[PDB]
Paper text:
A general observation, evident from the local resolution maps, is that in all of our [name] structures the protein displays substantial structural heterogeneity for most of its domains except for the TD, which indicates that it might be locked. Focused 3D classifications at the dimer level could not resolve the conformational flexibility, which suggests that the movements of the domains are, to a degree, independent within the dimer. Therefore, focused heterogeneity analysis at the protomer level with a mask excluding the TD was performed instead. For the apo dataset, four conformations with a resolution range of 3.2–3.4 Å and with substantially improved densities of all the domains could be distinguished. The most pronounced differences are confined to the region of the CHs. They are accompanied by subtle conformational transitions in the VSD and CNBD, which further indicates that the CHs might play a central role in coupling voltage sensing and [name] modulation to exchange activity in the TD. In line with this assumption, the extended cytoplasmic region of S4 forms several interaction areas with CHs, which have to rearrange upon voltage activation.
Numbering used by the authors: 71 to 537, 570 to 706, 725 to 783, 794 to 1012, 1031 to 1195
The structure:
Amino acid sequence: HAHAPKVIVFISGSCLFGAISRSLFKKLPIPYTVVLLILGAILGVVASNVPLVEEHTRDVAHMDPHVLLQIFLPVLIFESAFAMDVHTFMRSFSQVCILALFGLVVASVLTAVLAMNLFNYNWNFSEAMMFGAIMSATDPVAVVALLKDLGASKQLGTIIEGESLLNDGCAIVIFNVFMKMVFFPQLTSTVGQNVLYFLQVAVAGPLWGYAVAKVTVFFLSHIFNDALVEITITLAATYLTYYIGDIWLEVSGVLAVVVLGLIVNAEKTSISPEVEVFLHRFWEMLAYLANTLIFMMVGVVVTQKALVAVDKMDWFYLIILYLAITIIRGMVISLFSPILSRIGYGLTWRNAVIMTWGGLRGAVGLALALVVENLAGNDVIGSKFLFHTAGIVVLTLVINATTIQTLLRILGMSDISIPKRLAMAGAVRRIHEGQNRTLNMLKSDRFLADADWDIATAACEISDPYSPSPREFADMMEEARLRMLKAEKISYWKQFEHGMLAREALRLLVQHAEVAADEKDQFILVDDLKKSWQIKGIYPWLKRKLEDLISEKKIAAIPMPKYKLGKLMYKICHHMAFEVTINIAIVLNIVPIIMEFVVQDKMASQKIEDALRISNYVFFVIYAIEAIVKILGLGRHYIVSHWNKFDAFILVVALVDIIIAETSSIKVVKLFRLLRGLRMLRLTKALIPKLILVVNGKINNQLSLGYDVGKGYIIGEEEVGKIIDRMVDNKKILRELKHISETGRLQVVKELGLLQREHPGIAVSVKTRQAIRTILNHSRETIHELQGAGLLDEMEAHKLELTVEIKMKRLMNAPSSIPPPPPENLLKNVSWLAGDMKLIDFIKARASLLHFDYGEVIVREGDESDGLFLIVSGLVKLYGKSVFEDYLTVGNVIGEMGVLTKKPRNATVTCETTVQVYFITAEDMNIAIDTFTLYPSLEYRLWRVVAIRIATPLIMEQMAFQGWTQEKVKLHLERGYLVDLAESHFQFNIDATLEDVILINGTAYNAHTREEIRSPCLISRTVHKLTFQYTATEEPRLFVVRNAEYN
């Protein structure tokens, strides 16, 4: 009917035009957005002549400014923020801010002066500043897209993107400031009044955004199965942050959304992964809709209202303006180049050109132009604002956006590095080989013999998109160095693919490897990695100081009252419900404190101020009973704590002012100010624990990243060290490489072991978090394995896989600090004790806790193996000639092999810190071995623990070249078991059911050749059968792993 929404046809039609442009002009260098402007112009000219069409474009063309800003800008700004690589953005935050904020001011002011002097429009400074503001809002989406692939992607790409984000955010702020001075002027403004205005837009805005962000991520972390709720919460937070910010709080909405976008982006872990991928594609779609509409709207109104008021001179000014804003941006970048070069990633002269040429203008500039074109009404200023802004957008998108592709070439930035070319060629060649095998396999199929292979081969063709002498010695060294660093990069990627590394640690390690590859004679330096696990000094100090404030040890020392009258209260005094009730009462006291006092201020409603006085009586009564109960429970010791004395002062205030108030204006203001100022501050007692939790969280986030980088490096080095043994020939080179790897590994394992001592609880939290995450991951795999085998139905598989998903989400809410378990708990958790309560009691009764000081030697080489140590606290350094060094920390048990083979100790143990060890004597272990002999025998368990640790190096060395990482090998061995040579004193291999057989201890004879095999050897696949000697000196033990099919 006549009331039908006519914006539906325009909005939907805009989508179709966007699709058409985006499709047809996909290959041409001209960006599609230019075509949208042409189509908008066509709609404008045709609309002016055909009244029917005008009825459909009017509602959206002639659209109120506020509705333009309130709906579109939050989408554009949030989407831009939500799409950033925050981690890189933060690491270059200063460099972006200097160039964005200060650069924006100078760029706009210089443009403003140009507009005033050059143009004959006779604009004043306010209008010229609006012009400069809308002329300095960039939109480099087309340029960062190219930089994403070709080169210089990591640093340059995000710097231009972040700079554009911040200058867009600030340009709107400047535009808002100067628009009110032009279209909504005010009679007067004081200096102090303006300063408060600055604080609101510049300081309060970001704080409002930060508060809403931290509230949002809190709830998102507590939504477990509703994806729709997560998406809706994101939408509502984004729009309410802007609306409440601009309209109710009058703080800067755009900056609030910028901060909200960045915080929510950083806290992506709080969003379920499946939702995360949705949101990225969702906000992209919303931003794409916003761009398509704004460009078509400009195309419409520019022809209907703007081009009718354009003189020949205006065209001349547009060219001069385009040249000016281009050289101005370059001047700003160069001028700050000395500063920017000394922070973050310094700008090379070629990078500067990219930033200068890549400063495309776009939607935000146009959107703000439409506001002026609307507010100005019939004034020419509106038309000429829209004309120039549209002109600059067209010129930049025609000239800059098309030639940037060639400029990146001329500057020699698009070249693909040799490593990438080689990797792509190898991958393509392997794929090409993979298809030939598949193609042959199909040709043998009876049901596909008649298929047209000429077409099949042509269709499935993947094509490469990119198409002793010192001089001798140094050459191999450079070759080896690069062949090593390349291996590491692989080992990091393998770890990530198997969920062993967080993405951030992977990025750091790969970045360091790449940097080392570019430099000369450079390997990975741990000194560069240290920045990952160095805790900033502020946080430990804050944690210590805050924990001192609520120490309250002087209350814990208070004894029970000496008579029954106080005994009952004392119990209440230590019930959490008491403190919770008092806190709730206090926080409820805000309602009177605000309502009555603000009402009295307004009067300065008498019945309200008369009535609320009674609530003061009620809260006084509550606090009085609280004080009475506390004094009765504690007695004279009550006054000891400083927190209590503050409450005594508060009650003194209550008595004094409630009496005096009931009994000039000074008394009333005294009552109000004193009640408000004091009674709210006693919440800090309950607040401080939350601050401690926040601090823990900040430390945990840093320490966790440290462990990943440190542990990622160690595993990478361990894997590589068994590869270079066969990747390089020259022994001298080989020896030099491994020496560096070990001197790096020792530093990492030491420093990373000292952090645990500095922050015990946080370390335990981090580690238990890793433990759970690993368990769930491999728990997820079995579900896929069961699903893939068809052994479990798809719907049932999904039902299980949900419980894993919610479980992995609840990790993020786990406490940042777990109190370290006491020593007795460690014994309970030793690998070869778990579950055997009878054995645990036997050991716990005979384990003697010892304490050592720095530098003491627990055991020395050649000493008889008198027992084994479990390190419950500290860090010990092992230095054994069978040269070979290591550092062991909490949990690790020393001497497991010694008590079994009864052979002298292999390494000297020195304490790097104050160490505590549970010492179990060899005699006790022998007794335990003799007295605990069920199927999972203690001797069997001990050997199994040792066996795997001995086996893992052998299997790695034998199959490092293949695709298995360490975790896979260790799990692989986990399926194994030790054979009882008493059940059969000879072992017969079965190649179809035994995957690997390892000899751990004792000599074994080849049954046919009667060759003797040394103890730690990995039995070669060629051996058919083994015969074992029987001597007391070395009883032979053997480890085997069967195929999945149980024998």
